[PDB]
């Protein structure tokens, strides 16, 4: 199992997508035309996971860039690594989505979807052995929120035995103040719970609060938030991209991290935003979580930890045992050995030592409740439904979407209260 | 004749085959390209080393073995590594996609795509054999390929080769080096489905080996390379009775007669000595009494259990090197008076001894000292049921909530298989308790 | 004694054959139960996805037939 097919959908999807590709290209020694100017063989060893090999030793991202609004094509192409993307994989619709989910999922996205699916098939057929699909998008907008989740459901039908990853950007009043973002997210979440195997909750409220309090910024741009999201996206793909004694792919991740099919919402964390015990304490700290939850208000079902840099592997073992010992109550006792640890020698650009953290915590229900509450404030007085019922939707579908997400919260709560005896 | 075919399954199986076959080549003076200067009979022969190696007409000595994995990365390193010329390309077998830490995919979904090919190749080796003794199967308990493909293979081997003997060297999972949360499920499923088809099974506890590397070899954080080098030494001690001539050499099957009192009780505890660094072995010759005594120190065991709080049903000593019966007998006399050794009332209490004159060897650039003499004890103790118990408890914690069970059911398994397997292990734990109870 | 000597070897053959038989049959049993189960899981997954396509047809025919 080698090749992953990346899909960036909507504005959020395409900007965090571009950053992701800028960083990992830098980490693999790839420049904007797409040559290899590196030095280390480890950079090339599993380059196949994200790149195709064209003539003249030219490495080309396996990315599929999708939006209903053009100009997001222009910005991506005028950006640092815009030259590197494959020209035919840009699949940009006409009239845009204007922050409506029913336009993304039911009408306007429904036409463009087939011409995306053609780029997907072209990319999937040239895969020796395809593992799955990662979709970067947001859940607040229209295209990425709604077309993104139709693509998911349509890719699922042609490739139902392949893994479906999402980097799902969750919306917050502090970053964007569009009013219907709690509708769009709750509709998306009702799709995600059924059709993805694993979703990383990158969350705008957490990213704002980090940018503000940790990084000092008094009012931050999108570019500031995305410096974080790219650092995370670099970290939770390290075990896919570099060799290591561990072999690591999207299914092995899913099997080991997801104890119940519906509880596939991960809380990521990065550190720093320096020594091994401090790294280890920082990454289990609620300030370093890219979702806006507190580990100490629930329990970890499972954790992956990834350390990058030259460091004593003995020291890392002793520390990871340490935080499990000192924080024993915040892991469920009925899953043994539920915190694992990898180490890549090669650190990221800038830092000499990093540590990235993937947690499936039952405290992720704090995120689904904050969304649920902003949603329920609107829906119970039918606000802004002409946007949705106008494109054809029923009211039923809002009740189901709301109820499904409350079940998800209730189930996260059930396994938090569970006991070994 | 008396040929023995080795089958190496999944990463652990493969990487331990490297350690083993590298070691056997050094033990018999076989060069990387497969040539053996000291073999005057070119093309074939009847020599003791021919139980593990066929000869070609060109003078190549070729392992009677097959490496099998459902993904190419581990076997690709055998294809391009120091010993790439030793193996015929058809012995090294790979798929495109792994079992993903799932017994089900290893047994059914990915596994049934490659199984006929694997048996076809095993068959090609079996037909180079004038009197095939049986198979040696190397695999992890915890992997998806190691657990599920091995189970499928063992089932199929019982069909193609009847009652022809099958030995397992099984890697038992440990948290220090564990790769998957679901290892306890895989372990209990493979153990269950393999138990009627295996004749003897040497468990190796990764933790036990991990502890030995830290404690005795001064290794701060042992890798797989460190563990496999130690394991290959133990494997070598056990197979050395098959690979060497000797006046005092007792064959491995004769030990098996003593080691297996009922079909299900076929899990011997191994213990190896001396494991010592060069630094510590310098000006420090270890006598027969010291290494024999070290066999009853439970820190030297391959599985973490306590034989002292259990009962022996057999005790075999496999010595290699500068050892003569006199020293062995004196050493055993000392141990009987000074140590905690209680047999069940239905076994005779005699220790069965075997001796190979070929002293043990070391792989270049390793951590073990070259020593003049060495010993592997194979005991059948009820204590080893402790290992089943620990693992069965981890299984029960998860199975009570159905954690991860959907990943197995989605690939076609039913809940029935899980509980059927767990009850078999419940019965096995009860069997190991029964044999220890005194008669009336 | 000679007739007993033939009964014992016939028994040894019989039981060896029986093991090979019931292992062969037990195995074919499981592989067939599994394939039916795996296929039934994927058939249900695809039938839930084809039930969405058919709900998307109702929403696209509520915009076109409400104007
Ligand atoms: N973290 C982060 N969030 C972003 C970025 N760009 C947009 N967003 C968020 O995206 C959400 C809105 O979705 P967009 O991706 O802009 O919209 P879209 O899904 O493309 O839909 P349309 O613009 O309606 O076609 C809001 O919550 C924004 O704050 C970004 O670069 N980084
Ligand atoms: N002693 C030892 N143990 C190993 C080695 N490689 C992996 N393991 C252990 O084996 C278990 C994992 O099984 P693997 O053999 O890697 O898995 P696999 O059989 O290749 O199965 P998949 O990779 O899931 O198809 C864990 O307990 C590992 O610590 C090795 O070289 N030596
Ligand atoms: C209980 O937790 C796990 C068990 C197995 C896996 C699969 N592979 C994997 C991963 C991993 C896999 C895919 C993508 C990103 C990743 O970071 N990271 C680790 C770290 C340690 C380790 F032992 C395995 N890891 C994941 C988690
Ligand atoms: Ca010869
Ligand atoms: Mg847009
Ligand atoms: Mg493997």
GROMACS .gro file of N, CA and C in nm, chain B residues 94-212:
model
  357
  515UNK      N    1   0.604  -1.207  -0.196
  515UNK     CA    2   0.536  -1.089  -0.146
  515UNK      C    3   0.407  -1.061  -0.218
  516UNK      N    4   0.315  -0.993  -0.149
  516UNK     CA    5   0.197  -0.928  -0.208
  516UNK      C    6   0.220  -0.779  -0.219
  517UNK      N    7   0.113  -0.704  -0.245
  517UNK     CA    8   0.118  -0.559  -0.264
  517UNK      C    9   0.065  -0.481  -0.143
  518UNK      N   10  -0.017  -0.546  -0.061
  518UNK     CA   11  -0.099  -0.483   0.041
  518UNK      C   12  -0.096  -0.571   0.166
  519UNK      N   13  -0.075  -0.513   0.284
  519UNK     CA   14  -0.062  -0.596   0.403
  519UNK      C   15  -0.196  -0.628   0.471
  520UNK      N   16  -0.191  -0.708   0.578
  520UNK     CA   17  -0.310  -0.741   0.657
  520UNK      C   18  -0.357  -0.631   0.753
  521UNK      N   19  -0.276  -0.527   0.768
  521UNK     CA   20  -0.309  -0.412   0.852
  521UNK      C   21  -0.345  -0.446   0.998
  522UNK      N   22  -0.264  -0.529   1.061
  522UNK     CA   23  -0.281  -0.562   1.202
  522UNK      C   24  -0.416  -0.626   1.230
  523UNK      N   25  -0.468  -0.699   1.131
  523UNK     CA   26  -0.601  -0.759   1.135
  523UNK      C   27  -0.593  -0.908   1.098
  524UNK      N   28  -0.621  -0.995   1.195
  524UNK     CA   29  -0.617  -1.140   1.173
  524UNK      C   30  -0.703  -1.176   1.055
  525UNK      N   31  -0.817  -1.110   1.042
  525UNK     CA   32  -0.913  -1.143   0.938
  525UNK      C   33  -0.860  -1.123   0.798
  526UNK      N   34  -0.788  -1.014   0.774
  526UNK     CA   35  -0.738  -0.985   0.639
  526UNK      C   36  -0.627  -1.080   0.606
  527UNK      N   37  -0.546  -1.114   0.707
  527UNK     CA   38  -0.436  -1.208   0.692
  527UNK      C   39  -0.483  -1.349   0.665
  528UNK      N   40  -0.595  -1.386   0.727
  528UNK     CA   41  -0.653  -1.520   0.712
  528UNK      C   42  -0.746  -1.540   0.589
  529UNK      N   43  -0.831  -1.441   0.563
  529UNK     CA   44  -0.931  -1.445   0.458
  529UNK      C   45  -0.894  -1.350   0.345
  530UNK      N   46  -0.915  -1.219   0.364
  530UNK     CA   47  -0.923  -1.123   0.253
  530UNK      C   48  -0.795  -1.106   0.169
  531UNK      N   49  -0.687  -1.054   0.225
  531UNK     CA   50  -0.562  -1.045   0.149
  531UNK      C   51  -0.498  -1.184   0.136
  532UNK      N   52  -0.522  -1.271   0.235
  532UNK     CA   53  -0.449  -1.395   0.249
  532UNK      C   54  -0.479  -1.500   0.146
  533UNK      N   55  -0.607  -1.518   0.115
  533UNK     CA   56  -0.647  -1.620   0.017
  533UNK      C   57  -0.606  -1.587  -0.126
  534UNK      N   58  -0.558  -1.465  -0.151
  534UNK     CA   59  -0.506  -1.426  -0.281
  534UNK      C   60  -0.370  -1.486  -0.308
  535UNK      N   61  -0.291  -1.508  -0.203
  535UNK     CA   62  -0.153  -1.555  -0.218
  535UNK      C   63  -0.126  -1.699  -0.165
  536UNK      N   64  -0.222  -1.757  -0.096
  536UNK     CA   65  -0.203  -1.889  -0.034
  536UNK      C   66  -0.169  -2.005  -0.128
  537UNK      N   67  -0.233  -2.014  -0.245
  537UNK     CA   68  -0.199  -2.122  -0.343
  537UNK      C   69  -0.059  -2.106  -0.397
  538UNK      N   70  -0.020  -1.981  -0.424
  538UNK     CA   71   0.117  -1.954  -0.461
  538UNK      C   72   0.214  -1.999  -0.351
  539UNK      N   73   0.184  -1.970  -0.224
  539UNK     CA   74   0.275  -2.010  -0.115
  539UNK      C   75   0.289  -2.163  -0.104
  540UNK      N   76   0.178  -2.235  -0.112
  540UNK     CA   77   0.180  -2.382  -0.105
  540UNK      C   78   0.249  -2.447  -0.225
  541UNK      N   79   0.228  -2.389  -0.342
  541UNK     CA   80   0.298  -2.427  -0.465
  541UNK      C   81   0.450  -2.418  -0.445
  542UNK      N   82   0.500  -2.310  -0.385
  542UNK     CA   83   0.644  -2.294  -0.363
  542UNK      C   84   0.696  -2.383  -0.251
  543UNK      N   85   0.617  -2.402  -0.146
  543UNK     CA   86   0.651  -2.496  -0.040
  543UNK      C   87   0.661  -2.637  -0.097
  544UNK      N   88   0.569  -2.670  -0.187
  544UNK     CA   89   0.571  -2.796  -0.259
  544UNK      C   90   0.699  -2.816  -0.341
  545UNK      N   91   0.747  -2.713  -0.410
  545UNK     CA   92   0.873  -2.724  -0.486
  545UNK      C   93   0.996  -2.759  -0.402
  546UNK      N   94   0.998  -2.713  -0.277
  546UNK     CA   95   1.104  -2.749  -0.181
  546UNK      C   96   1.082  -2.888  -0.124
  547UNK      N   97   0.956  -2.921  -0.098
  547UNK     CA   98   0.922  -3.052  -0.044
  547UNK      C   99   0.961  -3.165  -0.139
  548UNK      N  100   0.961  -3.140  -0.270
  548UNK     CA  101   0.998  -3.239  -0.371
  548UNK      C  102   1.149  -3.247  -0.401
  549UNK      N  103   1.229  -3.152  -0.350
  549UNK     CA  104   1.374  -3.169  -0.342
  549UNK      C  105   1.417  -3.259  -0.225
  550UNK      N  106   1.321  -3.311  -0.148
  550UNK     CA  107   1.348  -3.382  -0.022
  550UNK      C  108   1.329  -3.533  -0.036
  551UNK      N  109   1.429  -3.608   0.007
  551UNK     CA  110   1.424  -3.754   0.002
  551UNK      C  111   1.355  -3.813   0.124
  552UNK      N  112   1.364  -3.745   0.239
  552UNK     CA  113   1.287  -3.784   0.360
  552UNK      C  114   1.248  -3.670   0.453
  553UNK      N  115   1.157  -3.583   0.407
  553UNK     CA  116   1.114  -3.463   0.480
  553UNK      C  117   1.061  -3.492   0.621
  554UNK      N  118   1.122  -3.428   0.721
  554UNK     CA  119   1.088  -3.446   0.862
  554UNK      C  120   0.970  -3.357   0.899
  555UNK      N  121   0.975  -3.230   0.860
  555UNK     CA  122   0.864  -3.138   0.885
  555UNK      C  123   0.897  -2.991   0.866
  556UNK      N  124   0.809  -2.903   0.913
  556UNK     CA  125   0.825  -2.758   0.896
  556UNK      C  126   0.858  -2.688   1.026
  557UNK      N  127   0.924  -2.572   1.014
  557UNK     CA  128   0.948  -2.480   1.124
  557UNK      C  129   0.888  -2.347   1.086
  558UNK      N  130   0.790  -2.301   1.160
  558UNK     CA  131   0.713  -2.182   1.120
  558UNK      C  132   0.745  -2.066   1.216
  559UNK      N  133   0.802  -1.959   1.160
  559UNK     CA  134   0.843  -1.841   1.234
  559UNK      C  135   0.742  -1.731   1.204
  560UNK      N  136   0.682  -1.673   1.307
  560UNK     CA  137   0.581  -1.569   1.289
  560UNK      C  138   0.550  -1.498   1.420
  561UNK      N  139   0.499  -1.376   1.411
  561UNK     CA  140   0.450  -1.306   1.528
  561UNK      C  141   0.306  -1.350   1.561
  562UNK      N  142   0.271  -1.345   1.690
  562UNK     CA  143   0.133  -1.359   1.736
  562UNK      C  144   0.052  -1.235   1.703
  563UNK      N  145   0.116  -1.119   1.703
  563UNK     CA  146   0.046  -0.991   1.706
  563UNK      C  147   0.014  -0.926   1.573
  564UNK      N  148   0.097  -0.952   1.472
  564UNK     CA  149   0.072  -0.902   1.337
  564UNK      C  150  -0.051  -0.961   1.271
  565UNK      N  151  -0.096  -0.897   1.164
  565UNK     CA  152  -0.210  -0.944   1.087
  565UNK      C  153  -0.172  -1.057   0.995
  566UNK      N  154  -0.053  -1.048   0.935
  566UNK     CA  155  -0.002  -1.155   0.851
  566UNK      C  156   0.048  -1.268   0.939
  567UNK      N  157   0.133  -1.235   1.035
  567UNK     CA  158   0.186  -1.330   1.133
  567UNK      C  159   0.080  -1.411   1.205
  568UNK      N  160  -0.033  -1.350   1.237
  568UNK     CA  161  -0.141  -1.422   1.306
  568UNK      C  162  -0.235  -1.498   1.211
  569UNK      N  163  -0.289  -1.426   1.113
  569UNK     CA  164  -0.392  -1.478   1.022
  569UNK      C  165  -0.341  -1.556   0.902
  570UNK      N  166  -0.231  -1.515   0.839
  570UNK     CA  167  -0.178  -1.597   0.729
  570UNK      C  168  -0.120  -1.729   0.782
  571UNK      N  169  -0.040  -1.721   0.887
  571UNK     CA  170   0.014  -1.840   0.953
  571UNK      C  171  -0.097  -1.939   0.987
  572UNK      N  172  -0.208  -1.892   1.044
  572UNK     CA  173  -0.318  -1.982   1.078
  572UNK      C  174  -0.372  -2.052   0.956
  573UNK      N  175  -0.399  -1.974   0.851
  573UNK     CA  176  -0.441  -2.029   0.721
  573UNK      C  177  -0.339  -2.130   0.665
  574UNK      N  178  -0.211  -2.096   0.674
  574UNK     CA  179  -0.105  -2.181   0.623
  574UNK      C  180  -0.097  -2.313   0.698
  575UNK      N  181  -0.109  -2.305   0.830
  575UNK     CA  182  -0.100  -2.422   0.916
  575UNK      C  183  -0.214  -2.516   0.885
  576UNK      N  184  -0.335  -2.461   0.875
  576UNK     CA  185  -0.452  -2.539   0.834
  576UNK      C  186  -0.427  -2.611   0.703
  577UNK      N  187  -0.378  -2.536   0.604
  577UNK     CA  188  -0.357  -2.590   0.472
  577UNK      C  189  -0.246  -2.692   0.473
  578UNK      N  190  -0.137  -2.664   0.544
  578UNK     CA  191  -0.028  -2.763   0.558
  578UNK      C  192  -0.073  -2.897   0.619
  579UNK      N  193  -0.167  -2.895   0.714
  579UNK     CA  194  -0.222  -3.018   0.769
  579UNK      C  195  -0.296  -3.099   0.666
  580UNK      N  196  -0.350  -3.032   0.564
  580UNK     CA  197  -0.420  -3.098   0.455
  580UNK      C  198  -0.321  -3.155   0.355
  581UNK      N  199  -0.228  -3.074   0.305
  581UNK     CA  200  -0.133  -3.121   0.205
  581UNK      C  201  -0.033  -3.220   0.263
  582UNK      N  202   0.009  -3.205   0.389
  582UNK     CA  203   0.116  -3.290   0.445
  582UNK      C  204   0.073  -3.374   0.566
  583UNK      N  205  -0.056  -3.393   0.583
  583UNK     CA  206  -0.104  -3.482   0.686
  583UNK      C  207  -0.055  -3.447   0.825
  584UNK      N  208   0.021  -3.540   0.884
  584UNK     CA  209   0.065  -3.530   1.026
  584UNK      C  210   0.217  -3.508   1.043
  585UNK      N  211   0.292  -3.510   0.931
  585UNK     CA  212   0.422  -3.444   0.918
  585UNK      C  213   0.436  -3.334   1.021
  586UNK      N  214   0.546  -3.332   1.096
  586UNK     CA  215   0.554  -3.251   1.217
  586UNK      C  216   0.567  -3.101   1.185
  587UNK      N  217   0.506  -3.015   1.267
  587UNK     CA  218   0.512  -2.869   1.250
  587UNK      C  219   0.546  -2.800   1.382
  588UNK      N  220   0.659  -2.729   1.386
  588UNK     CA  221   0.708  -2.656   1.502
  588UNK      C  222   0.683  -2.510   1.476
  589UNK      N  223   0.648  -2.436   1.579
  589UNK     CA  224   0.636  -2.290   1.568
  589UNK      C  225   0.739  -2.224   1.657
  590UNK      N  226   0.802  -2.119   1.607
  590UNK     CA  227   0.862  -2.017   1.691
  590UNK      C  228   0.774  -1.891   1.682
  591UNK      N  229   0.698  -1.865   1.789
  591UNK     CA  230   0.596  -1.762   1.790
  591UNK      C  231   0.639  -1.638   1.872
  592UNK      N  232   0.639  -1.519   1.812
  592UNK     CA  233   0.673  -1.397   1.885
  592UNK      C  234   0.551  -1.343   1.962
  593UNK      N  235   0.564  -1.338   2.095
  593UNK     CA  236   0.456  -1.302   2.185
  593UNK      C  237   0.470  -1.153   2.219
  594UNK      N  238   0.360  -1.077   2.210
  594UNK     CA  239   0.372  -0.933   2.202
  594UNK      C  240   0.404  -0.868   2.332
  595UNK      N  241   0.475  -0.757   2.326
  595UNK     CA  242   0.518  -0.685   2.443
  595UNK      C  243   0.501  -0.534   2.420
  596UNK      N  244   0.456  -0.460   2.524
  596UNK     CA  245   0.429  -0.316   2.508
  596UNK      C  246   0.548  -0.229   2.467
  597UNK      N  247   0.671  -0.270   2.497
  597UNK     CA  248   0.789  -0.189   2.466
  597UNK      C  249   0.811  -0.173   2.315
  598UNK      N  250   0.773  -0.275   2.238
  598UNK     CA  251   0.794  -0.278   2.092
  598UNK      C  252   0.665  -0.303   2.014
  599UNK      N  253   0.550  -0.297   2.080
  599UNK     CA  254   0.422  -0.332   2.018
  599UNK      C  255   0.377  -0.223   1.924
  600UNK      N  256   0.315  -0.265   1.815
  600UNK     CA  257   0.279  -0.184   1.698
  600UNK      C  258   0.127  -0.163   1.681
  601UNK      N  259   0.044  -0.231   1.762
  601UNK     CA  260  -0.100  -0.235   1.742
  601UNK      C  261  -0.175  -0.262   1.872
  602UNK      N  262  -0.290  -0.198   1.887
  602UNK     CA  263  -0.371  -0.212   2.007
  602UNK      C  264  -0.439  -0.348   2.008
  603UNK      N  265  -0.468  -0.398   1.889
  603UNK     CA  266  -0.543  -0.520   1.871
  603UNK      C  267  -0.457  -0.649   1.874
  604UNK      N  268  -0.331  -0.643   1.917
  604UNK     CA  269  -0.247  -0.763   1.922
  604UNK      C  270  -0.308  -0.876   2.007
  605UNK      N  271  -0.368  -0.845   2.124
  605UNK     CA  272  -0.433  -0.953   2.200
  605UNK      C  273  -0.542  -1.032   2.126
  606UNK      N  274  -0.618  -0.966   2.039
  606UNK     CA  275  -0.718  -1.035   1.956
  606UNK      C  276  -0.650  -1.126   1.854
  607UNK      N  277  -0.559  -1.068   1.777
  607UNK     CA  278  -0.486  -1.149   1.681
  607UNK      C  279  -0.422  -1.274   1.746
  608UNK      N  280  -0.366  -1.257   1.867
  608UNK     CA  281  -0.292  -1.361   1.939
  608UNK      C  282  -0.381  -1.477   1.979
  609UNK      N  283  -0.499  -1.444   2.030
  609UNK     CA  284  -0.593  -1.543   2.077
  609UNK      C  285  -0.660  -1.612   1.960
  610UNK      N  286  -0.676  -1.544   1.848
  610UNK     CA  287  -0.735  -1.604   1.728
  610UNK      C  288  -0.636  -1.702   1.665
  611UNK      N  289  -0.510  -1.661   1.649
  611UNK     CA  290  -0.411  -1.750   1.589
  611UNK      C  291  -0.384  -1.871   1.679
  612UNK      N  292  -0.369  -1.845   1.808
  612UNK     CA  293  -0.340  -1.951   1.902
  612UNK      C  294  -0.451  -2.054   1.889
  613UNK      N  295  -0.574  -2.009   1.896
  613UNK     CA  296  -0.688  -2.099   1.885
  613UNK      C  297  -0.690  -2.180   1.757
  614UNK      N  298  -0.679  -2.115   1.642
  614UNK     CA  299  -0.692  -2.187   1.516
  614UNK      C  300  -0.570  -2.270   1.480
  615UNK      N  301  -0.455  -2.244   1.543
  615UNK     CA  302  -0.331  -2.321   1.518
  615UNK      C  303  -0.307  -2.442   1.611
  616UNK      N  304  -0.380  -2.450   1.722
  616UNK     CA  305  -0.350  -2.545   1.831
  616UNK      C  306  -0.361  -2.696   1.796
  617UNK      N  307  -0.452  -2.734   1.706
  617UNK     CA  308  -0.463  -2.872   1.655
  617UNK      C  309  -0.358  -2.905   1.548
  618UNK      N  310  -0.296  -2.804   1.489
  618UNK     CA  311  -0.208  -2.823   1.376
  618UNK      C  312  -0.063  -2.809   1.409
  619UNK      N  313  -0.030  -2.757   1.525
  619UNK     CA  314   0.108  -2.744   1.563
  619UNK      C  315   0.137  -2.859   1.658
  620UNK      N  316   0.257  -2.916   1.645
  620UNK     CA  317   0.305  -3.027   1.727
  620UNK      C  318   0.388  -2.980   1.846
  621UNK      N  319   0.448  -2.863   1.833
  621UNK     CA  320   0.530  -2.802   1.937
  621UNK      C  321   0.544  -2.654   1.905
  622UNK      N  322   0.549  -2.570   2.006
  622UNK     CA  323   0.549  -2.426   1.984
  622UNK      C  324   0.637  -2.359   2.087
  623UNK      N  325   0.749  -2.303   2.042
  623UNK     CA  326   0.835  -2.227   2.131
  623UNK      C  327   0.790  -2.081   2.129
  624UNK      N  328   0.727  -2.034   2.237
  624UNK     CA  329   0.697  -1.891   2.250
  624UNK      C  330   0.818  -1.809   2.290
  625UNK      N  331   0.832  -1.693   2.227
  625UNK     CA  332   0.935  -1.595   2.263
  625UNK      C  333   0.866  -1.466   2.301
  626UNK      N  334   0.890  -1.419   2.423
  626UNK     CA  335   0.824  -1.302   2.477
  626UNK      C  336   0.918  -1.186   2.452
  627UNK      N  337   0.873  -1.092   2.368
  627UNK     CA  338   0.954  -0.977   2.332
  627UNK      C  339   1.007  -0.897   2.450
  628UNK      N  340   0.927  -0.893   2.556
  628UNK     CA  341   0.965  -0.825   2.679
  628UNK      C  342   1.082  -0.894   2.747
  629UNK      N  343   1.074  -1.028   2.753
  629UNK     CA  344   1.178  -1.111   2.813
  629UNK      C  345   1.310  -1.090   2.742
  630UNK      N  346   1.304  -1.085   2.609
  630UNK     CA  347   1.421  -1.063   2.527
  630UNK      C  348   1.465  -0.917   2.544
  631UNK      N  349   1.370  -0.823   2.542
  631UNK     CA  350   1.398  -0.680   2.567
  631UNK      C  351   1.470  -0.659   2.700
  632UNK      N  352   1.424  -0.725   2.807
  632UNK     CA  353   1.486  -0.713   2.938
  632UNK      C  354   1.625  -0.769   2.942
  633UNK      N  355   1.644  -0.882   2.877
  633UNK     CA  356   1.777  -0.946   2.867
  633UNK      C  357   1.877  -0.856   2.793
   0.00000   0.00000   0.00000
